[PDB]
Design an enzyme around this catalytic site. Sequence first.
Site, mmCIF file in Angstrom:
data_model
loop_
_atom_site.group_PDB
_atom_site.id
_atom_site.type_symbol
_atom_site.label_atom_id
_atom_site.label_comp_id
_atom_site.label_asym_id
_atom_site.label_seq_id
_atom_site.Cartn_x
_atom_site.Cartn_y
_atom_site.Cartn_z
ATOM 1 N N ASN A 265 0.832 -1.197 0.000
ATOM 2 C CA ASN A 265 0.000 0.000 0.000
ATOM 3 C C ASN A 265 0.876 1.261 0.000
ATOM 4 O O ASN A 265 2.007 1.231 0.477
ATOM 5 C CB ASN A 265 -1.047 -0.029 1.143
ATOM 6 C CG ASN A 265 -0.483 0.493 2.461
ATOM 7 O OD1 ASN A 265 -0.237 1.691 2.616
ATOM 8 N ND2 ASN A 265 -0.265 -0.380 3.440
ATOM 9 N N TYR B 245 -13.144 5.821 15.067
ATOM 10 C CA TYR B 245 -14.312 5.041 15.462
ATOM 11 C C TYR B 245 -14.287 3.709 14.701
ATOM 12 O O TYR B 245 -13.852 3.632 13.553
ATOM 13 C CB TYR B 245 -15.635 5.803 15.189
ATOM 14 C CG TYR B 245 -15.627 7.150 15.875
ATOM 15 C CD1 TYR B 245 -15.907 7.275 17.241
ATOM 16 C CD2 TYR B 245 -15.238 8.283 15.167
ATOM 17 C CE1 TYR B 245 -15.822 8.518 17.851
ATOM 18 C CE2 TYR B 245 -15.121 9.521 15.774
ATOM 19 C CZ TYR B 245 -15.464 9.639 17.111
ATOM 20 O OH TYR B 245 -15.342 10.879 17.667
ATOM 21 N N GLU C 192 -3.673 -6.073 7.587
ATOM 22 C CA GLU C 192 -2.529 -5.299 8.019
ATOM 23 C C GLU C 192 -1.903 -4.701 6.757
ATOM 24 O O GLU C 192 -1.395 -3.570 6.807
ATOM 25 C CB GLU C 192 -1.552 -6.196 8.789
ATOM 26 C CG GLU C 192 -0.285 -5.478 9.271
ATOM 27 C CD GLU C 192 0.845 -5.273 8.262
ATOM 28 O OE1 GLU C 192 0.728 -5.824 7.127
ATOM 29 O OE2 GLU C 192 1.858 -4.576 8.620
ATOM 30 N N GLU C 193 -1.925 -5.463 5.653
ATOM 31 C CA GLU C 193 -1.182 -5.050 4.459
ATOM 32 C C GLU C 193 -1.808 -3.800 3.839
ATOM 33 O O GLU C 193 -1.159 -3.092 3.065
ATOM 34 C CB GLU C 193 -1.097 -6.159 3.404
ATOM 35 C CG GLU C 193 -0.241 -7.394 3.808
ATOM 36 C CD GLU C 193 1.263 -7.130 4.017
ATOM 37 O OE1 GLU C 193 1.702 -5.960 3.989
ATOM 38 O OE2 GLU C 193 1.978 -8.089 4.236
ATOM 39 N N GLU D 36 -9.766 0.756 18.129
ATOM 40 C CA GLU D 36 -10.749 1.851 18.251
ATOM 41 C C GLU D 36 -12.025 1.396 18.964
ATOM 42 O O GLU D 36 -12.609 2.123 19.784
ATOM 43 C CB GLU D 36 -11.086 2.462 16.880
ATOM 44 C CG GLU D 36 -9.854 3.216 16.302
ATOM 45 C CD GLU D 36 -10.160 3.964 15.003
ATOM 46 O OE1 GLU D 36 -9.629 5.114 14.751
ATOM 47 O OE2 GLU D 36 -10.849 3.357 14.177
ATOM 48 N N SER E 210 7.143 2.160 12.964
ATOM 49 C CA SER E 210 5.787 1.767 12.600
ATOM 50 C C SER E 210 5.816 0.905 11.330
ATOM 51 O O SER E 210 6.853 0.312 10.985
ATOM 52 C CB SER E 210 4.894 2.975 12.438
ATOM 53 O OG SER E 210 3.557 2.533 12.197
ATOM 54 N N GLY E 211 4.657 0.781 10.661
ATOM 55 C CA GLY E 211 4.616 -0.169 9.550
ATOM 56 C C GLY E 211 4.214 -1.561 10.039
ATOM 57 O O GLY E 211 4.365 -2.543 9.298
ATOM 58 N N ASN E 212 3.681 -1.631 11.268
ATOM 59 C CA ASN E 212 3.178 -2.916 11.748
ATOM 60 C C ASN E 212 2.119 -2.674 12.818
ATOM 61 O O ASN E 212 1.945 -1.540 13.267
ATOM 62 C CB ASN E 212 4.307 -3.898 12.172
ATOM 63 C CG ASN E 212 3.999 -5.306 11.696
ATOM 64 O OD1 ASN E 212 2.944 -5.874 12.036
ATOM 65 N ND2 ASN E 212 4.842 -5.808 10.780
ATOM 66 N N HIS F 100 7.132 -9.245 -0.242
ATOM 67 C CA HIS F 100 5.835 -8.939 -0.882
ATOM 68 C C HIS F 100 5.745 -9.381 -2.356
ATOM 69 O O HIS F 100 4.918 -8.838 -3.103
ATOM 70 C CB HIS F 100 5.468 -7.448 -0.777
ATOM 71 C CG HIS F 100 5.066 -6.979 0.614
ATOM 72 N ND1 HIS F 100 4.655 -5.667 0.856
ATOM 73 C CD2 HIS F 100 4.947 -7.624 1.805
ATOM 74 C CE1 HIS F 100 4.262 -5.539 2.124
ATOM 75 N NE2 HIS F 100 4.460 -6.715 2.716
ATOM 76 N N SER G 131 15.601 27.869 24.945
ATOM 77 C CA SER G 131 16.292 27.114 25.993
ATOM 78 C C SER G 131 15.739 25.691 26.143
ATOM 79 O O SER G 131 14.526 25.494 26.088
ATOM 80 C CB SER G 131 16.215 27.822 27.317
ATOM 81 O OG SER G 131 16.945 27.065 28.261
ATOM 82 N N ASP H 230 0.016 -0.776 38.955
ATOM 83 C CA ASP H 230 -0.712 0.251 38.196
ATOM 84 C C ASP H 230 0.229 1.387 37.786
ATOM 85 O O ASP H 230 0.128 1.932 36.675
ATOM 86 C CB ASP H 230 -1.967 0.741 38.946
ATOM 87 C CG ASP H 230 -3.154 -0.199 38.893
ATOM 88 O OD1 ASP H 230 -3.036 -1.224 38.189
ATOM 89 O OD2 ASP H 230 -4.195 0.107 39.546
ATOM 90 N N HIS I 50 1.934 9.844 21.351
ATOM 91 C CA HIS I 50 2.998 9.618 22.331
ATOM 92 C C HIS I 50 4.022 10.744 22.115
ATOM 93 O O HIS I 50 4.414 10.994 20.985
ATOM 94 C CB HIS I 50 3.703 8.275 21.977
ATOM 95 C CG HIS I 50 4.516 7.638 23.075
ATOM 96 N ND1 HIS I 50 5.728 8.174 23.546
ATOM 97 C CD2 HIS I 50 4.329 6.487 23.776
ATOM 98 C CE1 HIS I 50 6.220 7.400 24.521
ATOM 99 N NE2 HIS I 50 5.350 6.368 24.700
#
EC number: 3.4.17.21
Lengths: 694, 694
Positions: free
Chosen positions: B203, B218, B370-371, B382, B463-465, B499, B574, B610, B633
Amino acid sequence: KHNMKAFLDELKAENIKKFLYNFTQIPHLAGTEQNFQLAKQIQSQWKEFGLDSVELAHYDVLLSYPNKTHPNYISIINEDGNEIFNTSLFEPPPPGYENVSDIVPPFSAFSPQGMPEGDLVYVNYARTEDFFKLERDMKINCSGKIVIARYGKVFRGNKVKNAQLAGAKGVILYSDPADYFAPGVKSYPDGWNLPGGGVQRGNILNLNGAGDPLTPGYPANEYAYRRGIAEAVGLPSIPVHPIGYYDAQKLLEKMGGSAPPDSSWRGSLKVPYNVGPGFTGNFSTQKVKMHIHSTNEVTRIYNVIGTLRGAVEPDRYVILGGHRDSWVFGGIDPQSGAAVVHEIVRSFGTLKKEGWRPRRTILFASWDAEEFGLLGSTEWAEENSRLLQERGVAYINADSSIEGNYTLRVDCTPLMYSLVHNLTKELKSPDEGFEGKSLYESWTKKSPSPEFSGMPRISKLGSGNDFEVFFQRLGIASGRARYTKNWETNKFSGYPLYHSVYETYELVEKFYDPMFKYHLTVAQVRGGMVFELANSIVLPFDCRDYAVVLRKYADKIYSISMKHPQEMKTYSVSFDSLFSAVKNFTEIASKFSERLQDFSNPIVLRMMNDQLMFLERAFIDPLGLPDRPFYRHVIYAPSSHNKYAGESFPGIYDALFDIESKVDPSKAWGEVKRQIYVAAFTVQAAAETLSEVA
Amino acid sequence: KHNMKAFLDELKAENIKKFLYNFTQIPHLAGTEQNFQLAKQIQSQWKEFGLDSVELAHYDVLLSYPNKTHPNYISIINEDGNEIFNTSLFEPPPPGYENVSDIVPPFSAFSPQGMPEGDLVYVNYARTEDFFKLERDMKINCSGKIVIARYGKVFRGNKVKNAQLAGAKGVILYSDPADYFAPGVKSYPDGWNLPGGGVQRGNILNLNGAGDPLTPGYPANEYAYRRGIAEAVGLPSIPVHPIGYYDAQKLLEKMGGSAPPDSSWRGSLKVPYNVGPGFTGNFSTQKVKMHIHSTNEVTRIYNVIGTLRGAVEPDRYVILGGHRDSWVFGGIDPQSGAAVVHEIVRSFGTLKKEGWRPRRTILFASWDAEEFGLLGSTEWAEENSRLLQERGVAYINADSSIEGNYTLRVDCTPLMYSLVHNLTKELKSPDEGFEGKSLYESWTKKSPSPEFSGMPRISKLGSGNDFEVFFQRLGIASGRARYTKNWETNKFSGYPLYHSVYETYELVEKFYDPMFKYHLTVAQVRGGMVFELANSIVLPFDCRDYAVVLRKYADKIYSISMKHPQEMKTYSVSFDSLFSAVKNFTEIASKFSERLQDFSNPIVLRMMNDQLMFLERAFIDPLGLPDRPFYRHVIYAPSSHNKYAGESFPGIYDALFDIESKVDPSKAWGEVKRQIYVAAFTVQAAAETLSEVA
Ligand SMILES: *[C@@H]1O[C@H](CO)[C@@H](O[C@@H]2O[C@H](CO)[C@@H](O[C@@H]3O[C@H](CO)[C@@H](O)[C@H](O[C@H]4O[C@H](CO)[C@@H](O)[C@H](O)[C@@H]4O)[C@@H]3O)[C@H](O)[C@H]2NC(C)=O)[C@H](O)[C@H]1NC(C)=O
Ligand SMILES: *[C@@H]1O[C@H](CO)[C@@H](O[C@@H]2O[C@H](CO)[C@@H](O[C@@H]3O[C@H](CO)[C@@H](O)[C@H](O[C@H]4O[C@H](CO)[C@@H](O)[C@H](O)[C@@H]4O)[C@@H]3O)[C@H](O)[C@H]2NC(C)=O)[C@H](O)[C@H]1NC(C)=O
Ligand SMILES: O=C(O)CC[C@H](NC(=O)NC[C@@H](NC(=O)CCCNC(=O)c1ccc(I)cc1)C(=O)O)C(=O)O
Ligand SMILES: O=C(O)CC[C@H](NC(=O)NC[C@@H](NC(=O)CCCNC(=O)c1ccc(I)cc1)C(=O)O)C(=O)O
Ligand SMILES: *[C@@H]1O[C@H](CO)[C@@H](O[C@@H]2O[C@H](CO)[C@@H](O)[C@H](O)[C@H]2NC(C)=O)[C@H](O)[C@H]1NC(C)=O
Ligand SMILES: *[C@@H]1O[C@H](CO)[C@@H](O[C@@H]2O[C@H](CO)[C@@H](O)[C@H](O)[C@H]2NC(C)=O)[C@H](O)[C@H]1NC(C)=O
Ligand SMILES: *[C@@H]1O[C@H](CO)[C@@H](O[C@@H]2O[C@H](CO)[C@@H](O)[C@H](O)[C@H]2NC(C)=O)[C@H](O)[C@H]1NC(C)=O
Ligand SMILES: *[C@@H]1O[C@H](CO)[C@@H](O[C@@H]2O[C@H](CO)[C@@H](O)[C@H](O)[C@H]2NC(C)=O)[C@H](O)[C@H]1NC(C)=O
Ligand SMILES: *[C@@H]1O[C@H](CO)[C@@H](O)[C@H](O)[C@H]1NC(C)=O
Ligand SMILES: *[C@@H]1O[C@H](CO)[C@@H](O)[C@H](O)[C@H]1NC(C)=O
Ligand SMILES: *[C@@H]1O[C@H](CO)[C@@H](O)[C@H](O)[C@H]1NC(C)=O
Ligand SMILES: *[C@@H]1O[C@H](CO)[C@@H](O)[C@H](O)[C@H]1NC(C)=O
Ligand SMILES: *[C@@H]1O[C@H](CO)[C@@H](O)[C@H](O)[C@H]1NC(C)=O
Ligand SMILES: *[C@@H]1O[C@H](CO)[C@@H](O)[C@H](O)[C@H]1NC(C)=O
Ligand SMILES: *[C@@H]1O[C@H](CO)[C@@H](O)[C@H](O)[C@H]1NC(C)=O
Ligand SMILES: *[C@@H]1O[C@H](CO)[C@@H](O)[C@H](O)[C@H]1NC(C)=O
Ligand SMILES: [Ca+2]
Ligand SMILES: [Ca+2]
Ligand SMILES: [Cl-]
Ligand SMILES: [Cl-]
Ligand SMILES: [Zn+2]
Ligand SMILES: [Zn+2]
Ligand SMILES: [Zn+2]
Ligand SMILES: [Zn+2]
């Protein structure tokens, strides 16, 4: 025994009276030295009272003040530009305080500076519907006019936003006797009514939950990066100033143009209430001129944060919070509330000195700068958001304990309905005619639920107070309770002397609560709620009460939509998914409740207390509501037309509002459907947090 | 005994081999019937294996497929518009599969349709720096050109975004032998190299974490409201198609215009690698024409979700997840990984049948689509975001177990560094020359840490997974591990047959891992990590490891900024607040660790578990990073130039990137300072989650 009765019995009317006197002798305006001094006093006493730690948390936030050497006022100016009439520079001080220094004169906090001159239009309460009536029905154009609006019905920030979007170049706010003078009672100091020289202060921001206008998202700490003023959140773009009814009568008496459209536009003064624009023939060349010179200034504020560490679950927080800053002396707002918090701390501290601790941690807060937009509570919550969202059990607000002497007024999450009913059944009514009867009995009698016989009215949480960040931003179960008036139509207007120099200790002691028994009853309600939330082994939340209201709100939003049957057919608008999610929530909540009744296993208990605590949290959507990123709760938001009122399914409500006026119905109904999907998904997701966990 | 050794010893190389064979006989493209059939097979076997419940979770998401009756291809077209050269319609199928049906031909998923004709420009790897070199240094204008780029170095979606913003009207991706043919090894089927007819599918979206392009935020459930295609997230605006090096040689051999600027632009084919635009003199009138007819279609996908309920903390989830969908047979990607998950489930299930349960709940996932952009994992997250954020302990990914046979490759949160070191010290090395030695010893020897003697390299998560939603959106501690090659420069490029139709069971069995010992070692690492995370009484996270890396990242971002000393002086930029927060984090983490060592009290334990679990969660900012709301993050995000690579302090990094080219330096440096404040505050806030709770 150390139990709730020991806690409640330690509370004393006489202590609350002494504290209220102590807190109301001098003004405590946010950002001023006297309010820093009172912060340090409260900090010292809370330590003395026995809390484990008591700190100040300070922030540097945008505040607003008049220019002491260049006063704000309004004029009627003649052809030549002579000012033939000027509004007052100050309210006449009350008896015995005519010498007290540093009373801030009436002003609208955060008004920009300017000296606009123009013709008046009278816009009633400046509500959405009032502007609709002017523009749509009466064809009056407010563009480039100075609008004059009566206070009442809705938050004044919404009035200013509405006047701004109508193209006004300035706003005059005034207190009409219709709204601020109860028939048959005397003006201060002889009674509790507003004198014609009295004026209501108050901010006119539209923050939508942001907190300090310069640091949305992040605490206004020492190294914070601030937006420039041009990018600040929520500041008005036109000058605004409030006046009393003697001054308003002078501005209104000469108004011409169109008659008021009906009697709902006429107040009580002896004037026609002509909408304008401008003055009648003889005075058609006179104009109104504002002079506003207030300045916005980054100023340090101080919250006091007291901790009573929990014996068993120290990492679970029950928060009692209310503000300390006042416009002037704060006789009702907020010191009535702060004196009650002070006595609650004292009582908890007494038990603590005898070796007791609550099961969970109790946090006590004296917030600063609430009057300038909930700034103190919101900045501290921004700083501590990760702790509050993973540990916050509940938040009980504690502004004014009384605004009247008739009966109790409670707004809270449905999760606390059962707690409130049960506690009030255990407390004594202070009301005349109900001696020996419960508070539940007197409250139910004087304020019946519109829905259920034998129950009292409890309202949705709105906003305009320090619970906003904890409930609508962070999703922590919240509640509040005070004594109120019997004046249904004045519900969101305030008591007559709201935010006036006349709100004094004497006002309360003479005319509201001479025996301090209503204060004591409110201390028992607020303190009792905190006690149960912090000490009950199973959190005192009933998820089934949420299921009941979700169905009521779904029926209500569906009814709104069904006023447009042709569009619902054309665009395939279905509420089926929302009703399905509500049905599921009902069924899963019923099953969870059976499990909660049917389990010595502390992990199962804490797992189930976590499910209860995180159930309010599940209604948060991290993407927020459209164009209001800090209102994240999908069931409740402050009304986009009136920050004081709560609205249910606000995302769908706002998508449906005035939809018949949208130019692209396909797009508008698409957005309705999108909001139905968000609400249905959020309800189902919240329900599933109550399913068996694995 | 039921302990980790019992778990690990039950894992068998031979089982993994059988499962890999079973999973790779026919294609399993997302959205196709054969991949639904395999989902049902895995569901059945996981039940058979002994999990408590195994469900399918389905969603209807945007996928993309070629038109079976209207093939995609590229031409060189002469003056007259005769197509004198056409690229292949399919890869030559490998031995024994020349009859296997439903092999999807090479295409770029989510390409729009079109038939653009124009002159070629060769853009090397189409990286940010390659476009800088073309436009800034060589003054070549890609506007209205078809660009041809070699695969490698960075995610192909970033290439397409970069070509789009350079004004390309189409993109041709090809595999250069420099990047996909290792010297001295044979082409498939005689070795593991890419043949000239081989082509890499994949992709070309730029989702930035959104999941299904039509339903950002969602789950794409039955009643979901979808965006229109024009408002979908991340779709490319120009046609794109991938080819092999035999076809690329035909497109490149005639290129004229400018020479390549240096040797880093030259691949291995026998062509000049002229940048263009267009062809040399004789062929200057020929053009390149793409024909793309693929269609985007909402299609149902199925995740399999297996649950092994925890004995003690069933409301704490440790997740082992990897995908099942493949481009063709998925010999390495993903069935190498899925066969290992299958054997891990089998082993856990064996213990369960003998009466064991893990302390915490283990969730097992077989992700779909995933692909096509991590769609299955992201939609399920979600849907379940409230459960995962309040209960999610950790996520271990499980795509391809091997991409080579040299040594281990691990990317993970610093919270798992100590866990990985300790586990690998307890596992046997499978490597030749290290018999009788630990995996830690062989891995450390072959892949030394650049920072510390005697330690191995562990990388930041990129990422990519399928870990992306769990780590960068939700803040759940995540990790992954596989066996890899020794080819430092090919780090983000993929193994040669990535691939391609040639990625078969035989590829693995003959050339990668004939004895299945590298698969078994990876099953021990992944399974061992899950075992410890799900069973250790104290969560096996060491907060001090985060303190060490935060300082390294702060030093690194400060160094980047200090290339601009004059601007840092002018704008008062600074880093003091960030270093202060890091120092505080170090000190508080040290104190927390002492308390963790120094406490029979299950509440204190769970309170402290926790704190460990919510420490990764504290790095989330609910406002997201600029223009990337699903990367929340603050310490780690996928590089804005290469989705595969992680970047640290991404908000500051992106504010500093190419800053010397910004037209308004005051605004640009203001944004640097804003990001420093966000990062310093987030670090301090995360630190404070480890302070005593009250
Ligand atoms: C309230 O709770 C109930 C659970 O008690 C939950 O029910 C679920 O509803 C959905 C419908 O939204 C069901 O989804 C179906 O799943 C089956 C496979 O199990 C599919 O084959 C169905 O798809 C076909 O039919 C559709 C409708 O005609 C077509 O649009 C589609 O193209 C397919 O032909 C469909 O996806 C789901 O099975 C149940 N789950 C149960 C009963 O366990 C309900 O959704 C909850 N409400 C909300 C708002 O979440
Ligand atoms: C790391 O942890 C330390 C705690 O060990 C924490 O220290 C805090 O730093 C701030 C400075 O950012 C201190 O804030 C000061 O607070 C005093 C009152 O206590 C104020 O009077 C100070 O304001 C004056 O001075 C400023 C600087 O000259 C002026 O700008 C200002 O106008 C005032 O004149 C100032 O607000 C705070 O007291 C300490 N807290 C301690 C030591 O407990 C540090 O902030 C942490 N790092 C991060 C990034 O959070
Ligand atoms: O910036 C902001 O968002 C608000 C700042 C400031 N807050 C207050 O003065 N709040 C005190 C009180 N307000 C009033 O009494 C005015 C009438 C509206 N309140 C309620 O109807 C009302 C009162 C009690 C209850 I229980 C329910 C509703 C109040 O609403 O608490 C202000 O309004 O100027
Ligand atoms: O839409 C998306 O976001 C991704 C969809 C799809 N995902 C994959 O094919 N991922 C498999 C694998 N990728 C590769 O091997 C290509 C080289 C980049 N990977 C790593 O460098 C790499 C490999 C292993 C490790 I440990 C670290 C880095 C991978 O990165 O896992 C794709 O890339 O087309
Ligand atoms: C409000 O009460 C406080 C506390 O009793 C009073 O502050 C104390 O005043 C005495 C006499 O000046 C001092 O010795 C103490 O140090 C103060 N205690 C504090 C600040 O904790 C204060 O005077 C009272 N205010 C009014 C207006 O009556
Ligand atoms: C409010 O009081 C009612 C009546 O005592 C409580 O409901 C009872 O709770 C007990 C203890 O779990 C059950 O055994 C009874 O069956 C309940 N009676 C009912 C529902 O009529 C209720 O839990 C209290 N609400 C709280 C504590 O939030
Ligand atoms: C992969 O393994 C599965 C499971 O052993 C095989 O599916 C079984 O096939 C037999 C014979 O057709 C059936 O009786 C079972 O019902 C199947 N079990 C399932 C689906 O759970 C499958 O045939 C194997 N595939 C290949 C290509 O070898
Ligand atoms: C990895 O192993 C080390 C060495 O055993 C563990 O560190 C020890 O933990 C014990 C038990 O709490 C302490 O008493 C020792 O002082 C530690 N030794 C050290 C730090 O050298 C470490 O906790 C393990 N990491 C995990 C379990 O994540
Ligand atoms: C207040 O007004 C005076 C003049 O009346 C002016 O000199 C001073 O700058 C003003 N103070 C401000 C803007 O804070
Ligand atoms: C109103 O105030 C202005 C400014 O001080 C002054 O010039 C004017 O005389 C005043 N008008 C009246 C009627 O007092
Ligand atoms: C209101 O007045 C202004 C002109 O002064 C104009 O721009 C605006 O269009 C008017 N709106 C009407 C008449 O609806
Ligand atoms: C207090 O209660 C009496 C009795 O109804 C009422 O008449 C009086 O107005 C009340 N005071 C206030 C301020 O409401
Ligand atoms: C595929 O291409 C054919 C013509 O070759 C066309 O008739 C059909 O509509 C296309 N299918 C699609 C667009 O899904
Ligand atoms: C390429 O394909 C097109 C379309 O089928 C065809 O017209 C042309 O002859 C082909 N050219 C070559 C060289 O095969
Ligand atoms: C690139 O080419 C197009 C004209 O075909 C033009 O719009 C653009 O400005 C050019 N950019 C340059 C020369 O920098
Ligand atoms: C397997 O290991 C050997 C030994 O170094 C190596 O030469 C061979 O190329 C490896 N296979 C792969 C696919 O890397
Ligand atoms: Ca702020
Ligand atoms: Ca989605
Ligand atoms: Cl309140
Ligand atoms: Cl992986
Ligand atoms: Zn107040
Ligand atoms: Zn107020
Ligand atoms: Zn994969
Ligand atoms: Zn892949």
